[PDB]
Design a protein around this nucleic acid. Sequence first.
DNA 1: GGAAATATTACC
DNA 2: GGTAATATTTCC
Length: 57
Amino acid sequence: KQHNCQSCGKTFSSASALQIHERTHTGEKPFGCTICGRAFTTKGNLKVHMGTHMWNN
DNA sequence: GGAAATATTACC
DNA sequence: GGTAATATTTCC
Ligand SMILES: [Zn+2]
Ligand SMILES: [Zn+2]
């Protein structure tokens, strides 16, 4: 079966993936960076952001 | 089978 | 550059 966005019609592979896509219509940002405050739309995107805070040699 | 992580593309 | 958005891969 298919999981189509009821807002823009675009189709995604899973229910979980459609639910991540739907975050673009609401503007929600459920993943915060405790260092600078900035909020992000996925876990992975905050994760990649956290690397910009690494002194890391 | 499908959520989750991630690799990748798209967009500014 | 770096964040947004999704496509592909890992994991149960
Ligand atoms: Zn949509
Ligand atoms: Zn930050």
